[PDB]
Design an enzyme around this catalytic site. Structure first.
Site, PDB file in Angstrom:
ATOM      1  CB  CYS A 295      -1.761 -20.625  24.788  1.00 11.44           C
ATOM      2  SG  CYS A 295      -1.807 -20.809  26.600  1.00 11.44           S
TER       3      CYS A 295
ATOM      4  CG  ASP B  16      -3.093 -11.559  20.672  1.00 13.12           C
ATOM      5  OD1 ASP B  16      -2.603 -10.788  21.549  1.00 13.12           O
ATOM      6  OD2 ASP B  16      -3.017 -12.824  20.714  1.00 13.12           O
TER       7      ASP B  16
ATOM      8  CG  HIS C 195      -2.186 -17.066  22.928  1.00 13.40           C
ATOM      9  ND1 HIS C 195      -3.350 -17.297  23.646  1.00 13.40           N
ATOM     10  CD2 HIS C 195      -1.185 -17.101  23.801  1.00 13.40           C
ATOM     11  CE1 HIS C 195      -3.026 -17.482  24.930  1.00 13.40           C
ATOM     12  NE2 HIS C 195      -1.722 -17.337  25.052  1.00 13.40           N
TER      13      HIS C 195
ATOM     14  CE  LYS D  89       3.066 -11.513  26.637  1.00 11.57           C
ATOM     15  NZ  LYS D  89       3.268 -12.787  25.895  1.00 11.57           N
TER      16      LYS D  89
ATOM     17  CD  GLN E 105       5.943 -11.631  23.524  1.00 12.40           C
ATOM     18  OE1 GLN E 105       5.373 -12.096  24.514  1.00 12.40           O
ATOM     19  NE2 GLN E 105       7.226 -11.228  23.535  1.00 12.40           N
TER      20      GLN E 105
HETATM   21  C1  LIG Z   1       0.400 -13.328  21.736  1.00 12.25           C
HETATM   22  C2  LIG Z   1      -0.444 -13.506  22.909  1.00 12.25           C
HETATM   23  N1  LIG Z   1      -1.779 -13.473  22.800  1.00 12.25           N
HETATM   24  C3  LIG Z   1      -2.598 -13.649  23.909  1.00 12.25           C
HETATM   25  C4  LIG Z   1      -2.103 -13.954  25.158  1.00 12.25           C
HETATM   26  C5  LIG Z   1      -3.086 -14.187  26.323  1.00 12.25           C
HETATM   27  O1  LIG Z   1      -2.908 -12.962  27.123  1.00 12.25           O
HETATM   28  P1  LIG Z   1      -3.517 -13.166  28.711  1.00 12.25           P
HETATM   29  O2  LIG Z   1      -5.084 -13.035  28.544  1.00 12.25           O
HETATM   30  O3  LIG Z   1      -2.878 -12.030  29.434  1.00 12.25           O
HETATM   31  O4  LIG Z   1      -3.211 -14.615  29.168  1.00 12.25           O
HETATM   32  C6  LIG Z   1      -0.730 -14.058  25.312  1.00 12.25           C
HETATM   33  C7  LIG Z   1      -0.039 -14.439  26.531  1.00 12.25           C
HETATM   34  N2  LIG Z   1       0.690 -15.748  26.387  1.00 12.25           N
HETATM   35  C8  LIG Z   1       1.435 -16.317  27.538  1.00 12.25           C
HETATM   36  C9  LIG Z   1       0.572 -17.263  28.408  1.00 12.25           C
HETATM   37  O5  LIG Z   1      -0.335 -17.943  27.802  1.00 12.25           O
HETATM   38  O6  LIG Z   1       1.149 -17.604  29.540  1.00 12.25           O
HETATM   39  C10 LIG Z   1       2.706 -17.152  27.069  1.00 12.25           C
HETATM   40  O7  LIG Z   1       3.005 -17.033  25.848  1.00 12.25           O
HETATM   41  O8  LIG Z   1       3.220 -17.980  27.883  1.00 12.25           O
HETATM   42  C11 LIG Z   1       0.083 -13.878  24.158  1.00 12.25           C
HETATM   43  O9  LIG Z   1       1.416 -13.884  24.327  1.00 12.25           O
END
Ligand SMILES: Cc1ncc(COP(=O)(O)O)c(/C=N/C(C(=O)O)C(=O)O)c1O
Ligand SMILES: Cc1ncc(COP(=O)(O)O)c(/C=N/C(C(=O)O)C(=O)O)c1O
Lengths: 406, 406
Positions: free
Chosen positions: A362, A199, A122, A225, A202
């Site tokens: 992202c 990270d 991400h 999440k 998820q």
């Molecule tokens: C694997 C992983 N790494 C980092 C993030 C970012 O976490 P956030 O700072 O809570 O937005 C996320 C959150 N992703 C969301 C978003 O960008 O809305 C998604 O996958 O839609 C993620 O899933």
């Protein structure tokens, strides 16, 4: 055994219609819904014991402090950290990773040093490192992916060298659903003299995390999440690393002594928590943990394994649809319809009450690796059902028919 | 005209006892309580339309986005910014000031440059500058205070030079209650080629803010002090300054294009908002603004002028008590009892149900200037009454008697 009816009953948001159809919320990888236990925790905080934190001043102040620090212990237990000194409350996974990039990477990188990441990361786990390497003159490298979107340990061993100082990688991909072999990657990083940054945005909502077993050096997660309030997250770091890191932000609460020109810092974890903290949010995150623990993370993971296996099977029943990533996976499916832009898939599904996400998620470098410009994603959690997946695949079939006729 | 009974009725937390006495909450400078309008806003968000932000994907997503961006417009109107591009959501005043110190000061300071602050600053508006000047080899200077704890414009003109690049100062002191002459300080900074950074954490809850009239270059505030949720704040900056500043944090949402090694940023304000935002908190802050606007900030300011004048008069009725700072002030009194440590004052007051704060109030340099090591503070807001101040002064009298006998 987990009763999905009784679980769904606790989430008021699930019980409504969109465009005259029952809501089918399949976007928990973007954000999760909350049970009454968490919402009512926020309510009780603001109705009864809101105050700034610091014990031994007044009664509501002590209750607020005990709630906040209590939540820190809940988090410690939940990811099996050794110490509350290793549990830092942040605004979210993104801020947590930025703190590592600022306070750790920018202080331990020089020309010749490498930061190793992966093509499936991400943005939150790409851009801070891009910036850290530019500031220090270090090099960014990418671990290649296998054809099914997994990482082989042979490729890790190849990419990581004795010049690697940091490996940063997702626990679980928010697009492919891949569960990366973090524990084995940590050993490869350590063998090369590197730290590993995980990270966990998820993974943490959906499966048990044990930071001692993973042996990760840093681990980042988001409340929003995992059934918890928005605007809060955690940075876990090994205490000996955090001790030697400077603060990312400065102000009240994180100081011990302040002179005109120089200051000293508080001990961990408060060294990394500047200003009035995220009091209500942290307390509500502790309540999310309590709720998830009562159900059982293993139970939740088993439910999602079932949903994922069912979804993959039902997607294979559709002509003209591509699913990305491996068979063994977390509870999400990213896909495209052969002749339909995924933004239009999402729009048409929403008119049937079904919430999915379309775009790059992202992960623009991963989309390029996949040779696509965008995808649609259905993502699941503890409140979702097979009937909902039936609705999704039926709607995708109708979508294909609809754009065929047009 | 403002009815205090009808206002107090909206704050459930006020209606309880501590140690068998009606709560008397006099610590709103540490944090403020919330009305049902704000708590119910959070409830309605999590019960009905929580989703991640980005319009045109699904129905709840669009509702969440409209709520979040709607709240940004509320804030713009509330401080009279020109543009939503100038309104950045942060975790709080402390983070807001750190962002200026990181992205503005560290890029515009060199040896010989000065940052000018004041002896009455909170730590949040000291430590980031201490760190910025150390990183750049610049100089930190302090504007002196007059004997009643105010700042004379002659001393400002003396301290600020053509080598000054940044003046940073509180709008209102959280200890002295001084209202600083920010509009006139801004002219002196500008005349010298400097920008002015205003710490508005204590002003914004309690009086109208007009950033165009103040002509401040940056302005920072906290939700939790102005009837709003914890964990959220605002950074206002003039658009032309923000345009030229680099982001303080990196990730999703603040990017436009992401390559393997390089990225481009979104336009303002999103350039400065990395990751999933503080969705619920921001929406609740917008509801706090709505609530405060309905009552009227001028009305609130008039109420507090009355409380402050009444408190100062009643404190002058007590022998053996010192009050710090000027006659004309915001709604707070910091004091000491001649023969009693302020921590023991706070403890004994809490047994009478009265919540005050004791310590340095995140202003250790000011305490040194005052020649004390700690103080007690009673601070007021729109829900407090003269009867509560009567209770405070009666309890202080009893406190003196009690420690005299012992
Ligand atoms: C694997 C992983 N790494 C980092 C993030 C970012 O976490 P956030 O700072 O809570 O937005 C996320 C959150 N992703 C969301 C978003 O960008 O809305 C998604 O996958 O839609 C993620 O899933
Ligand atoms: C003038 C002024 N500047 C900055 C701050 C810090 O705002 P925060 O980041 O919301 O903690 C504050 C908040 N001060 C509180 C606190 O430290 O608990 C108080 O005065 O007790 C302040 O009043």
């Amino acid at each position: 055994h987990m009763n999905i009816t009784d679980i769904r009953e606790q989430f008021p948001i699930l019980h409504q219609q969109v465009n005259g159809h029952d809501l089918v919320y399949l976007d928990s990888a973007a954000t999760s819904q909350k049970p009454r236990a968490v919402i009512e925790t926020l309510d009780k905080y603001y109705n009864q014991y809101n105050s700034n934190v610091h014990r031994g001043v007044h009664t509501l102040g002590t209750r607020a402090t005990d709630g906040y620090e209590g939540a820190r212990e809940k988090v410690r237990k939940f990811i099996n950290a050794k110490s509350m000194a290793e549990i830092i409350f942040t605004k979210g996974t993104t801020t947590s990773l930025n703190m590592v990039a600022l306070s750790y990477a920018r202080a331990n990188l020089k020309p010749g040093d490498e930061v190793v990441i992966t093509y499936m990361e991400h943005h939150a786990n790409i851009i801070p490192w891009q910036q850290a390497v530019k500031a220090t003159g270090a090099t960014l490298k990418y671990i290649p992916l296998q054809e099914d979107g997994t990482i082989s340990l042979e490729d890790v061993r190849e990419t990581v060298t004795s010049n690697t100082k940091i490996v940063a990688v997702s626990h679980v991909s928010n697009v492919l659903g891949t569960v990366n072999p973090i524990k084995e990657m940590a050993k490869i990083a350590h063998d090369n003299g590197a730290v590993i940054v995980v990270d966990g945005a998820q993974s943490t909502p959906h499966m048990k995390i044990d930071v001692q077993d993973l042996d990760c050096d840093f681990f980042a997660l988001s409340s929003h999440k995992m059934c918890g309030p928005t605007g809060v997250g955690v940075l876990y770091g090994k205490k000996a690393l955090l001790e030697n890191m400077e603060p990312a932000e400065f102000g009240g609460e994180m100081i011990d002594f302040v002179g005109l020109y120089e200051s000293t810092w508080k001990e961990l974890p408060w060294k990394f928590e500047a200003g009035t903290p995220i009091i209500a949010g942290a307390i509500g995150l502790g309540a999310a943990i309590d709720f998830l623990e009562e159900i059982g993370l293993d139970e939740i993971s088993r439910h999602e394994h079932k949903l994922a296996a069912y979804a993959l099977e039902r997607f294979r029943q559709l002509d003209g649809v591509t699913v990305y990533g491996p068979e063994e996976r977390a509870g999400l499916v990213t896909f495209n319809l052969d002749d339909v832009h995924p933004h239009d898939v999402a729009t048409v599904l929403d008119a049937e009450g079904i919430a999915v996400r379309a775009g790059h998620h992202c992960a623009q470098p991963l989309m390029k690796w996949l040779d696509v410009t965008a995808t649609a994603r259905a993502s699941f959690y503890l409140y979702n059902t097979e009937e909902e997946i039936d609705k999704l695949v039926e709607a995708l079939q109708k979508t294909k028919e609809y754009f065929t006729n047009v």
